[PDB]
Write a protein that binds this ligand. Structure first.
Ligand SMILES: NC(=O)C1=CN([C@@H]2O[C@H](COP(=O)(O)OP(=O)(O)OC[C@H]3O[C@@H](n4cnc5c(N)ncnc54)[C@H](O)[C@@H]3O)[C@@H](O)[C@H]2O)C=CC1
Ligand SMILES: NC(=O)C1=CN([C@@H]2O[C@H](COP(=O)(O)OP(=O)(O)OC[C@H]3O[C@@H](n4cnc5c(N)ncnc54)[C@H](O)[C@@H]3O)[C@@H](O)[C@H]2O)C=CC1
Ligand SMILES: NC(=O)C1=CN([C@@H]2O[C@H](COP(=O)(O)OP(=O)(O)OC[C@H]3O[C@@H](n4cnc5c(N)ncnc54)[C@H](O)[C@@H]3O)[C@@H](O)[C@H]2O)C=CC1
Ligand SMILES: NC(=O)C1=CN([C@@H]2O[C@H](COP(=O)(O)OP(=O)(O)OC[C@H]3O[C@@H](n4cnc5c(N)ncnc54)[C@H](O)[C@@H]3O)[C@@H](O)[C@H]2O)C=CC1
Lengths: 404, 404, 404, 404
């Protein structure tokens, strides 16, 4: 019956999501190359079991209400701000994403930008397109020999460090968790001392109160004069007026910014920034993530996360939902989603005790207000089909399924 | 040594060169940040033992011939077209330079350009300085997994191949001479194959009859649709209008040009190109070697060649002159430069035999119509002074002197 | 926690283990440098909550059954043949160990042996301790450029291959399962080919019907005349008399054996071998894993497994027991071990339902005839204490306890 | 006439010397596998133009006197103590050797020995061959993580450092010349501080007053307790009674020695050392050099050094002779060896001046008492054949040749 399970894919996810899905039997797929209208969406999602969307579709409480058959949501993207998770949670629908499929794409972007920034290319190039010729060597540098200071040594920070070392830089980092340095990286205990020694400082941190304006005047002023600050992390992490002044005073020699406190909503919208007045600043429209390889990594991972929720019930890594996962070890398995309150499990288990059916394995995890329980029982179809009926009738039940 | 020996240094040679000069005793130095006009050049060089210059200074027959005391010429620079080699060799003046002194600067620039060109970054940055936001993934790619086509696997081609490899690209090269690949690089027999296959092609060929318009419309169309072409070898290698067509036709995704058929004379003259209308092209004012690190190596190297030759008469690597070098062992040493014709050498030696002075070592090399010779003899100072004077008189003599 | 929980540690476990134990609150520790006789073992374990042992201590049915308070068993050691798994699982006692805790020690030993065996060094050293000087080059070789034949490309085979490679040997392997090569390693289909080609063959196979006498006279003669055979997998893998013949016949140049069919019981029992008469053989008393670094990792790892399971009931990686682990979220947690038969779980849950205590999370895994379960519930201490007592009464119950 | 030029090769040089020689036309070769008698030597060398010998033939003044046609001597070995250089110098015969063809062989030996020493293998193995079984882990270590202190950072010291780094050691060195560290090596300014930090100290220095007993009691006592000292450099550099005591007090845990203050003259002779009483000492009979690859490297290099002296007159690197070398740049070249006294060169050059023959190039280097001069002249055979006659007649001449 997989062929009767519908997958609606909007905004054109990578073709590899399709391959990895048609490899798992789910062949009933409506694919669109672009974002649907305030209204054709709803018509299309109505009998969809799985929807796959990107950063531009707004999966709002109004729209999820439209969807009578919806089972799980797959965001082929890093963010989920475009989805009402609380809406999906209430209806028993997990939402999955791809928070780390972009690593390489971002590191490689930071290497090229620091190669050309260190060389003054971005300025030479803007003058060139304006018919001005600006040769000089004064203040142009190669990267081999330079110090790179990476702030935030997680997935991307560590790939970058490695890349940079290939080019002969001395990598140095600062993270809040103590870490195990790869290669020759070197942890620095105080931020201010990372800043003083760094020819190039690159931010690779998450978004939150600890990161709101982490790089402000005070921190920028600590940077080594003549240095470059590159930020492809979060738009909230550097102070733009403060960077603008530091660029103006030539205290920095340049910058690359991929993310801004306010980003235009669409390509059609206009982009405005006080940094646009600087030739020696790379400004990109949030594309550190935007490669076909990441599109592909993302395609594979989020489709596999939907395949697994569909096949064996796993909600490992779900964003809005209790995480649960059981090793496949026995024919016959079911799941049950319910209001997290006293007595539900007991009722559930009774359906089998009271008829001599043996429970092989069970995993239950709860949220403030909901529970996911996956159970493996030694029974046959008829018995299960029946237990499923009964489970569905359990006061507090939101939904339940017979996975196999 | 002798703080009387005048060095004229012009066009802002790296300060390293002056440190080297001063560490060797030579303190008498006229330094200029830039070039000089005909009269003040001619004025500064009237009494100069050595000159150091860059590309903007033109030592012509007439110039050199009025440099009364000129002993040698150092081109702090790869090329020597600014200098009249022949004219110097006739006055017995060796010219030195710095042959391969920026292989790394160019390799590294190429790596940064292809990272950003592959990402469509140059365009997005142009557009962003104009208020336009352009967030795509559609033609963007990571460098890892891609094929780099290197045309000309020499000093620079080779060194580029290693960087590219240590970045996960597959490296293929096409060269007119069978070469032994470094790392996992692969030589391709047919230039057409390399083009069709490569995702990025970067030119590294010399300037000569066989490279002129090496990449015209034929060769460009053999390139992978959506690929990229980078050129930081020689202005003469690429049909620039071919290239503008192929770009306007979207047959190439972008390109990066460091050198052009006709380059501006100075930073005041206008830069004109068909390629300036394309946001997706990097134009740089011929800066592949314009790096402090390079200027520094050049400066060390060439002031070195001049000290070694003021001090011990070496001319290993001179560009207009017979190459000779003698290991220092036995105080004193002299040298003589003469027309290359039978009889001189015997004449020269006899000056020593007939007064019973022993000749410790000696090296003579000749060109076409000049010969050169360094001699070591065992004698106190006066005998050397006097014998020198005899050597000047030998028929054929151009120039001679006493080193220590 | 509770400085009352008795750990018995015997056969001189690494001190790291005690540091780990003490950092987690458990200070009540009886440590022994060596093994104990039947009566004092039995005396030390009568009131022991946990035991740590090595290979010389034999926990038999009778032993385990008189360990009144035994909660778990850690084999600080790769193997568990010393321990009665079944007998422990029936008393609801999980046994842990350290699966692959010395891949590196063995790889490194193999590398040092083949460097010296290839050089004929072992012989020259024997001879030199007898007054005899033997200075040859005739059958001596460097490792670089030679072929290493690895039989069994697993944890250790793999890790050896990398070391060998980073030393310039060519690495070939023969394995019964298609494996993906690391570095430039190459899988060979026919064991005979590998033998004929390889200069050094090193065995890394498990002990089982298919490896017994895996290298008898046939296979040895297929080896390269003058080659070398190293074995630090299992005593049972090599026809040792075959091997002595092939050595006396000069068909092999040497060998290195870490393990033998019959090993001495202790450092007092005699070691006998046909191979002892050959100077050109390295004999080692089964020390491929006997390194401080390894003992330390083992010690950290296994005292870890015991703390995690005293504290939160984990049994990830236990060797006789259903594997279950639950992320710590909501104070309190309990666990129950029972015969695996219908009815228990419902019985167990109902204890909570019927008094309105909410069950936060729960994990049950079962084996054959045992089931295991960890539960999180929201209740103050007294209710937990009391409910525990009820759980003990559930029919089927083997053992239960309250973790926090 | 090359086929009429005889090459006598004793002690069995590597077959590659023969290939590289028969590649250059010299095909008239008497090869022996072993060292000739006090007398068959002389019979065989009598009309030899080139002899090639190893460490065991004594090329003494008595024997060189035997040799009427001898031109150059090739020691297919590092040492030349077996040759009377002064004897050969007087007769105009250069002696060549292979001082650096052994690098890899020695480094690889030091790696294997430090692998097994760190493991206590040498002791376990000696007990094993004596029927004693000695398991322990206490004090056995892997190398990854350890500090290696290399004393003398020349050809071998640097190859070793690299090797060691592959195995994960921290390399540290001490040399008297300041050096450029490869990889992650680290120069240490004071010996005593290299010693304190080093788990393994390995000597790689030359022989001379600065090295006589460099490692004496005082220096050994500075070593980190528990460390190992490995010496495959020179027999004069460590104090053997002082090492013996330090091994006795267990201040060191072991050692490898390849060279001794007194080495037996032949395999037949007896070897005696106070270290032979130690199981935990590797003792080798000076075989750090003894591999087929070094035999081969040596074969190629010293045969090529004889080929070049024979073909173009180069004495670059000759051990007993003035070093001289001219680039091939012109048909016709001759050499002349003479007493270093006033007037010889003049006479030589006159032979050409006085007949209109032009000297293209000349290199003359002198010794305390002899001169090598190589000259290139623009003439034809007849003229040269004639000049050769005359040159031979020059008061002070020892020998002369027409190379081509
Ligand atoms: N520019 C773009 O298109 C994209 C941006 N990213 C972003 O890059 C950032 C990092 O990404 P990943 O490394 O993949 O995740 P990650 O979780 O591995 O990186 C977080 C790291 O930051 C360190 N850190 C957290 N707070 C810190 C603070 N207060 N001060 C210093 N260090 C701190 C953490 O210890 C951790 O190592 C995220 O914000 C992620 O969304 C990821 C993909 C694309
Ligand atoms: N962008 C800049 O400011 C600078 C440009 N360059 C230029 O880049 C070029 C490369 O320099 P190097 O690597 O030192 O050159 P190189 O001398 O090391 O190698 C050039 C290679 O091209 C090959 N080659 C020659 N003619 C060819 C042909 N027609 N087709 C294909 N291969 C051919 C040769 O076999 C040679 O291997 C030179 O022209 C150099 O002047 C060098 C430094 C700076
Ligand atoms: N010398 C010592 O004191 C120690 C010995 N060992 C032993 O060395 C052996 C290797 O251990 P690991 O690398 O962890 O093993 P592993 O489990 O990682 O791999 C063994 C490999 O051998 C292959 N294999 C199995 N049967 C085979 C057969 N009959 N013919 C060819 N290949 C076969 C399997 O495919 C597997 O890939 C084990 O027996 C282990 O007990 C391990 C540690 C220390
Ligand atoms: N064991 C064997 O069969 C063989 C031994 N060797 C020997 O190894 C030794 C080193 O060989 P290579 O490295 O190839 O020659 P090398 O000349 O490159 O090594 C000499 C190094 O020792 C350093 N050094 C010299 N005197 C020192 C002192 N007073 N204190 C500290 N450092 C000092 C020098 O600066 C230089 O870097 C030589 O004695 C050589 O004959 C070489 C081949 C085989």
């Amino acid at each position: 019956e997989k062929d009767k399970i519908k997958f609606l894919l909007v905004e054109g996810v990578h073709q590899k999501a399709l391959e990895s899905l048609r490899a798992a039997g789910y062949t009933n797929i409506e694919f669109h190359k672009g974002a649907l209208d305030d209204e054709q969406l709803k018509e299309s999602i109505r009998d969809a079991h799985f929807i796959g969307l990107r950063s531009r579709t707004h999966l709002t409480e109004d729209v999820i209400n439209a969807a009578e058959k919806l089972v799980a949501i797959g965001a082929f993207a890093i963010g989920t701000n475009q989805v009402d998770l609380d809406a999906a949670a209430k209806r028993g629908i997990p939402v999955f994403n791809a928070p780390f499929s972009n690593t390489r794409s971002v590191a490689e972007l930071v290497i090229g930008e620091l190669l050309l920034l260190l060389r003054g290319v971005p300025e030479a190039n803007a003058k060139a397109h304006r018919g001005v010729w600006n040769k000089l060597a004064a203040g142009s540098f190669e990267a081999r020999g330079k110090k790179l200071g990476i702030i935030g040594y997680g997935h991307i920070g560590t790939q970058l460090g490695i890349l940079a070392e290939s080019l002969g830089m001395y990598v140095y980092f600062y993270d809040i968790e103590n870490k195990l340095p790869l290669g020759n990286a070197t942890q620095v205990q105080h931020l201010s001392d990372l800043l003083n020694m760094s020819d190039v400082v690159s931010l690779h941190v998450p978004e939150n109160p600890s990161t709101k304006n982490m790089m402000g005047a005070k921190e920028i002023s600590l940077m080594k004069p003549g240095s470059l600050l590159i930020n492809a992390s979060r738009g909230t992490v550097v102070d733009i007026p403060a960077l603008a002044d530091a660029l103006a005073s030539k205290h920095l020699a340049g910058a690359a910014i991929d993310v801004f406190p306010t980003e235009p909503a669409t390509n059609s919208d206009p982009f405005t920034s006080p940094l646009a007045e600087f030739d020696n600043v790379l400004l990109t429209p949030h594309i550190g993530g935007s490669t076909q390889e990441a599109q592909e990594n993302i395609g594979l991972e989020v489709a596999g996360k939907l395949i697994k929720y569909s096949d064996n019930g796993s909600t490992l890594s779900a964003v809005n939902f209790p995480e649960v996962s059981l090793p496949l070890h026995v024919v016959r398995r079911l799941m049950h989603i319910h209001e997290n309150r006293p007595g539900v499990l007991t009722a559930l288990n009774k359906i089998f005790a009271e008829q001599g059916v043996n429970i092989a394995a069970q995993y239950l995890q709860t949220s403030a207000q909901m529970g996911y329980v996956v159970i493996d029982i030694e029974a046959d179809e008829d018995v299960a089909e029946k237990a499923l009926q009964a489970m569905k009738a359990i006061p507090g039940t939101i939904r339940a399924r017979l996975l196999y």
